[PDB]
Design an enzyme around this catalytic site. Structure first.
Site, PDB file in Angstrom:
ATOM      1  N   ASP A  12       0.792  -1.366   0.156  1.00 58.11           N
ATOM      2  CA  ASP A  12      -0.203  -0.135   0.089  1.00 58.11           C
ATOM      3  C   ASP A  12       0.785   1.299  -0.098  1.00 58.11           C
ATOM      4  O   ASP A  12       1.941   1.355   0.487  1.00 58.11           O
ATOM      5  CB  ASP A  12      -0.937   0.043   1.299  1.00 58.11           C
ATOM      6  N   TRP A  17       3.371   7.646  -2.463  1.00 61.09           N
ATOM      7  CA  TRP A  17       4.765   7.463  -3.058  1.00 61.09           C
ATOM      8  C   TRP A  17       5.048   8.477  -4.233  1.00 61.09           C
ATOM      9  O   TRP A  17       6.014   9.586  -4.176  1.00 61.09           O
ATOM     10  CB  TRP A  17       5.062   6.226  -2.873  1.00 61.09           C
ATOM     11  N   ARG A  25       0.006   7.733 -10.239  1.00 57.05           N
ATOM     12  CA  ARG A  25       0.009   6.604  -9.537  1.00 57.05           C
ATOM     13  C   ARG A  25       0.822   5.427 -10.006  1.00 57.05           C
ATOM     14  O   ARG A  25       1.477   4.670  -9.399  1.00 57.05           O
ATOM     15  CB  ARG A  25      -1.661   6.181  -9.090  1.00 57.05           C
ATOM     16  N   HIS A  29       3.437   2.184  -9.026  1.00 62.57           N
ATOM     17  CA  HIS A  29       3.010   0.700  -9.141  1.00 62.57           C
ATOM     18  C   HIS A  29       4.374   0.013  -9.677  1.00 62.57           C
ATOM     19  O   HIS A  29       4.557  -1.061  -9.331  1.00 62.57           O
ATOM     20  CB  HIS A  29       1.961   0.236 -10.282  1.00 62.57           C
ATOM     21  N   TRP A  61     -10.677  -3.635  -9.452  1.00 62.97           N
ATOM     22  CA  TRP A  61     -11.401  -3.392 -10.775  1.00 62.97           C
ATOM     23  C   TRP A  61     -12.118  -2.308 -10.848  1.00 62.97           C
ATOM     24  O   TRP A  61     -12.579  -1.868 -11.842  1.00 62.97           O
ATOM     25  CB  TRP A  61     -12.253  -4.809 -11.119  1.00 62.97           C
ATOM     26  N   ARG A  63     -11.154   0.844 -10.015  1.00 62.74           N
ATOM     27  CA  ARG A  63     -10.086   1.714 -10.192  1.00 62.74           C
ATOM     28  C   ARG A  63     -10.360   2.461 -11.572  1.00 62.74           C
ATOM     29  O   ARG A  63     -11.041   1.617 -12.692  1.00 62.74           O
ATOM     30  CB  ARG A  63      -8.406   1.428 -10.155  1.00 62.74           C
ATOM     31  N   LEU A 123      12.225 -19.922  -2.130  1.00 61.67           N
ATOM     32  CA  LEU A 123      11.011 -19.129  -1.420  1.00 61.67           C
ATOM     33  C   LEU A 123       9.917 -19.280  -2.713  1.00 61.67           C
ATOM     34  O   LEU A 123      10.066 -19.192  -3.769  1.00 61.67           O
ATOM     35  CB  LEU A 123      11.178 -17.744  -1.388  1.00 61.67           C
ATOM     36  N   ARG A 190      -6.055  -1.919   8.815  1.00 63.81           N
ATOM     37  CA  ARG A 190      -7.185  -2.636   8.484  1.00 63.81           C
ATOM     38  C   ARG A 190      -6.867  -3.818   7.824  1.00 63.81           C
ATOM     39  O   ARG A 190      -5.897  -4.174   7.244  1.00 63.81           O
ATOM     40  CB  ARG A 190      -8.366  -1.675   7.725  1.00 63.81           C
ATOM     41  N   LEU A 191      -7.952  -4.611   7.925  1.00 64.60           N
ATOM     42  CA  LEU A 191      -8.069  -5.870   7.214  1.00 64.60           C
ATOM     43  C   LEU A 191      -8.951  -5.563   5.867  1.00 64.60           C
ATOM     44  O   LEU A 191      -9.730  -4.724   6.043  1.00 64.60           O
ATOM     45  CB  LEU A 191      -9.169  -6.675   8.012  1.00 64.60           C
TER      46      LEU A 191
HETATM   47  C1  LIG Z   1       2.557  -7.503  -7.802  1.00 64.90           C
HETATM   48  C2  LIG Z   1       2.904  -6.084  -7.937  1.00 64.90           C
HETATM   49  C3  LIG Z   1       4.472  -5.783  -7.324  1.00 64.90           C
HETATM   50  C4  LIG Z   1       2.304  -4.904  -8.437  1.00 64.90           C
HETATM   51  C5  LIG Z   1       2.483  -3.539  -8.487  1.00 64.90           C
HETATM   52  C6  LIG Z   1       1.491  -2.626  -7.585  1.00 64.90           C
HETATM   53  C7  LIG Z   1       0.266  -2.777  -8.065  1.00 64.90           C
HETATM   54  C8  LIG Z   1      -0.430  -2.631  -9.402  1.00 64.90           C
HETATM   55  C9  LIG Z   1      -0.693  -2.988  -6.917  1.00 64.90           C
HETATM   56  C10 LIG Z   1      -2.411  -3.233  -6.978  1.00 64.90           C
HETATM   57  C11 LIG Z   1      -3.136  -1.862  -6.633  1.00 64.90           C
HETATM   58  C12 LIG Z   1      -2.638  -1.312  -5.347  1.00 64.90           C
HETATM   59  C13 LIG Z   1      -3.467  -2.050  -3.968  1.00 64.90           C
HETATM   60  C14 LIG Z   1      -1.534  -0.600  -4.936  1.00 64.90           C
HETATM   61  C15 LIG Z   1      -0.971  -0.150  -3.553  1.00 64.90           C
HETATM   62  O1  LIG Z   1      -1.098   1.382  -3.552  1.00 64.90           O
HETATM   63  P1  LIG Z   1      -2.255   2.273  -4.002  1.00 64.90           P
HETATM   64  O2  LIG Z   1      -2.439   2.757  -5.142  1.00 64.90           O
HETATM   65  O3  LIG Z   1      -3.562   2.012  -3.269  1.00 64.90           O
HETATM   66  O4  LIG Z   1      -1.844   3.552  -3.210  1.00 64.90           O
HETATM   67  P2  LIG Z   1      -2.402   4.950  -2.345  1.00 64.90           P
HETATM   68  O5  LIG Z   1      -3.143   4.310  -1.238  1.00 64.90           O
HETATM   69  O6  LIG Z   1      -1.261   5.662  -1.798  1.00 64.90           O
HETATM   70  O7  LIG Z   1      -3.295   5.577  -3.070  1.00 64.90           O
END
Ligand SMILES: CC(C)=CCC/C(C)=C/CC/C(C)=C/COP(=O)(O)OP(=O)(O)O
Ligand SMILES: Cc1onc(-c2ccccc2Cl)c1C(=O)Nc1ccc(C(C)C)cc1
Ligand SMILES: Cc1onc(-c2ccccc2Cl)c1C(=O)Nc1ccc(C(C)C)cc1
Ligand SMILES: CC(C)=CCC/C(C)=C/CC/C(C)=C/COP(=O)(O)OP(=O)(O)O
Lengths: 230, 228
Positions: A12, A17, A25, A29, A61, A63, A123, A190-191
């Site tokens: 998260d 970031w 955003r 990623h 989905w 987003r 791993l 949170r969960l």
């Molecule tokens: C497996 C891997 C390394 C994937 C790349 C990252 C990715 C696309 C993750 C899915 C979306 C997500 C939950 C991002 C986390 O940050 P956020 O967008 O929720 O950030 P924020 O809370 O600051 O908005």
């Protein structure tokens, strides 16, 4: 001192970031993939047996379409930047969730990495994709009832251990199905429906650190905090 | 503006008692006082449900004398708490596999349930001989039997149907899931407490030992929930 055998990671803070760097955003990623590579290689060297990462939830989905499209393309276009190195590091790649509904090229990139690394003994990097805990439990309870009805198994066979064999985590070795530690970054307490059955007895670790900044030192601090737990 | 359903994992009774040079059981009695204070305050604040992790499936591993003392608490101290909760319009309920409970313990809980069953205020829900995985498993034994009897089909097995077969089915539909889960004594784990119902819950951890958790501590938890 104990090395958690299975670590669950809720990544998260990719958007926050990227925003701190005046970037969209999606830039976060991509840096999130770099962070995952660093963490995976270090955890493998430390003796961690499984990392389950919450890569894409069924809620993700919702987003914006352009962001979802960018995300789905990441393992397709950047496969060469990460998968040959994980393979050279003896890391086994797997996935959990309703993956038959991922876009074809995304599903093919993941299946290609699985086939390449299937004999690897280090791993296991386990991607939870199109995943939700309640949906995972529902599909298990449904498949079990069908087996009882077909007389493949009888109602007396319905136990907690049987349910575990029908969850998506059934492909992990039996002694490694449950995370010992679950990490959530960016200070969210949170969960979010991540491994609710498997993680029922897990130690939890929360950090304000944004996921792209989570590195080997941050992983060592999580393991140190885990070792001070009783 | 309060969380409608709060899940509470009471912890630190032993450490609380030890600081006072007392055995763990002294802490469990003070834990009942803390629960009474929290319940009455939460009811006045507008909280609709409190689910308390009173006795887990793991708690049977405790020494026999301690397990025996714990099971006797609602039997021995019924008059100290139940008439007051009833006067406060609090409804008492329980979730879990209550057949393993000793007869007198089961009777004391059922007597409190029967007394308060018409009450319209906060529902104090005791999770007793409870484990989340066991709760989900029992829901499947019931669902499978209904599928086999053709009362339902395997195609009817949805997330919504599973919710109606969990022990929490007796809470009103919009109150089955905790909005907030609290764990005291700085312990960072959920320990198989409402894993299905609490899948999206906000979590709150405090170093405060359970017998010290009072109205001010409940207000701090609610304040933290409101900033989420
Ligand atoms: C497996 C891997 C390394 C994937 C790349 C990252 C990715 C696309 C993750 C899915 C979306 C997500 C939950 C991002 C986390 O940050 P956020 O967008 O929720 O950030 P924020 O809370 O600051 O908005
Ligand atoms: C780091 C890293 O190391 N291996 C992978 C990977 C694994 C399988 C296939 C392709 C890749 Cl790039 C990888 C990675 O971040 N994979 C990834 C990234 C994003 C997604 C999206 C579909 C949520 C899915 C998988
Ligand atoms: C506070 C409080 O307010 N009412 C009760 C209560 C509720 C039902 C029956 C008897 C009692 Cl004393 C109560 C309480 O602490 N009950 C309780 C205490 C201990 C146990 C053990 C069996 C885990 C079970 C229930
Ligand atoms: C419903 C109610 C108010 C019941 C009375 C308290 C009670 C008997 C709870 C069950 C045991 C338990 C998990 C106690 C928490 O402190 P701990 O004993 O684990 O303390 P420690 O971690 O400091 O040893």
């Amino acid at each position: 001192t104990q090395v958690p055998a299975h670590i669950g990671i809720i990544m998260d803070g990719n958007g926050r970031w990227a925003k701190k760097r005046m970037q969209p955003r999606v830039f976060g990623h991509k840096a999130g993939m770099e962070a995952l590579q660093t963490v995976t290689k270090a955890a493998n060297k430390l003796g961690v047996k499984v990392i389950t990462v919450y890569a894409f939830s069924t809620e993700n989905w919702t987003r914006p379409d352009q962001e979802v499209k960018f995300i789905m393309n990441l393992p397709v276009e950047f496969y060469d930047n990460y998968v040959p190195e994980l393979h050279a590091n003896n890391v086994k790649i797997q996935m959990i969730g309703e993956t038959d509904r991922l876009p074809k090229q995304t599903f093919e990139a993941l299946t290609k990495a699985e086939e390449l690394t299937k004999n690897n003994t280090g791993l296991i990097l386990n991607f939870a994709l199109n995943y939700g805990g309640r949906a995972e439990i529902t599909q298990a309870l449904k498949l079990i009832s069908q087996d009882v009805l077909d007389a493949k198994i009888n109602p007396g066979d319905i136990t907690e251990e049987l349910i575990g064999n029908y969850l998506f985590t059934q492909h992990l070795p039996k002694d490694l199905r449950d995370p010992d530690l679950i990490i959530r970054t960016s200070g969210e307490l949170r969960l979010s429906n991540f491994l609710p059955w498997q993680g029922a007895y897990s130690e939890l670790y929360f950090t304000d650190t944004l996921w792209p900044d989570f590195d080997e030192a941050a992983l060592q601090e999580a393991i140190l905090a885990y070792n001070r737990r009783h």
